[PDB]
Amino acid sequence: TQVIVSPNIAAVKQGGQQQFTAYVRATNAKDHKVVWSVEGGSTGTAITGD
Amino acid sequence: DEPTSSTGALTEFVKKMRATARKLTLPQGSRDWNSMAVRTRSYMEDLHL
Amino acid sequence: TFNDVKTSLGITESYDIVNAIRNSQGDNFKSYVPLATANNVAEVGAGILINQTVQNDFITSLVDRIGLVVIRQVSLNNPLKKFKKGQIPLGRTIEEIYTDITKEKQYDAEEAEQKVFEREMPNVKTLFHERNRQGFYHQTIQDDSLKTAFVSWGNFESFVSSIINAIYNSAEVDEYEYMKLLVDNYYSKGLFTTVKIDEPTSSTGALTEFVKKMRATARKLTLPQGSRDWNSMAVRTRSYMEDLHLIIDADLEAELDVDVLAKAFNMNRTDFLGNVTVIDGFASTGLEAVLVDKDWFMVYDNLHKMETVRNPRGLYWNYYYHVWQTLSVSRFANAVAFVSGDVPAVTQVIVSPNIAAVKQGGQQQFTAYVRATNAKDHKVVWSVEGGSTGTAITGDGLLSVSGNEDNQLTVKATVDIGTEDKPKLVVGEAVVSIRPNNASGGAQA
DSSP-assigned states of every residue in C83-130: GEEEE--S-SEEEEEEE---PPPPP-HHHHTT-TT------EEEEEEE
Residue C383 contacts residue C393 (beta carbons within 8 Å): yes
Chains with 3+ CB–CB pairs under 8 A to C are A
B24: Cβ contacts below 8 Å, ≥ 6 apart = B30, B33, B41, B42, B47
Out of C199, C201, C205, name the one closest to residue A10 (CB): C205
| Cα separation, C264 vs C261, whole angstroms | 5
If you measure CA to CA, which chain C residue comes closest to A14? C202
Ramachandran quadrant class, A31 (left: phi over 0; alpha: psi -120 to 50; beta: rest): left
Structural resolution in Å: 3.6
Residue type, C396: D
Chains with 3+ CB–CB pairs under 8 A to A are B, C
Residue C111 contacts residue C142 (beta carbons within 8 Å): no
Identify the H or E element spanning C318: strand C317-326
Residue C190 contacts residue C350 (beta carbons within 8 Å): no
| Cα separation, C377 vs C359, whole angstroms | 33
- Strand C287-293 to C335-340 pairing: antiparallel
Nearest CA to A18 out of A36, A34, A32, A40 is that of A36
Q: Does B32 touch chain A (CB under 8 A)?
A: no
Q: Does A33 touch chain C (CB under 8 A)?
A: no
C108: Cβ contacts below 8 Å, ≥ 6 apart = none
Residue type, C53: T
As beta bridge partners, residue C324 has C134, C303
Q: Does A25 touch chain B (CB under 8 A)?
A: yes
As beta bridge partners, residue C349 has C370
Q: What burial class does residue A39 get, using C-beta atoms within 10 Å of its C-beta: 0-12 exposed, 13-18 middle, 19+ buried? A: exposed
| Cα separation, C410 vs C400, whole angstroms | 13
Residues comprising chain C, all counted: 445
- Strand C397-398 to C317-326 pairing: unpaired
Nearest CA to A16 out of C261, C252, C338, C205 is that of C205
Q: How was this structure determined?
A: cryo-EM
Q: Does A19 touch chain B (CB under 8 A)?
A: no
Tell me the torsion sign for CA atoms C78, C82, C88, C94. Answer: negative
Q: Could you report how far apart the first and last alpha carbons of chain C are, in Å?
A: 98
CA distance A24 to chain B (A): 8
Ramachandran quadrant class, C47 (left: phi over 0; alpha: psi -120 to 50; beta: rest): left
CA distance B15 to chain A (A): 13
| Cα separation, C73 vs C402, whole angstroms | 70
Nearest CA to C393 out of C368, C371, C425, C420 is that of C368
- Strand C124-141 to C317-326 pairing: antiparallel
CA distance A10 to chain C (A): 6
DSSP C346-400: EEEEEES-SB--EETT---EE-EEEEESSSS--PEEEE--S-SSS----SSEE--
- Strand C93-99 to C299-310 pairing: unpaired
Nearest CA to C162 out of C180, C143, C135 is that of C143
As beta bridge partners, residue A22 has A5
Q: What are phi and psi of C160, to 5 degrees?
A: -60, -45
Set of chain A residues whose Cβ sits within 8 Å of the Cβ of B11: 4, 23
Helix (H, G, I), strand (E, B) or coil at C324: strand
Helix (H, G, I), strand (E, B) or coil at B6: coil
Angle at C53 between CA C49 and CA C55, to 5 degrees: 135
| Cα separation, C382 vs C147, whole angstroms | 74
| Cα separation, C195 vs C212, whole angstroms | 12
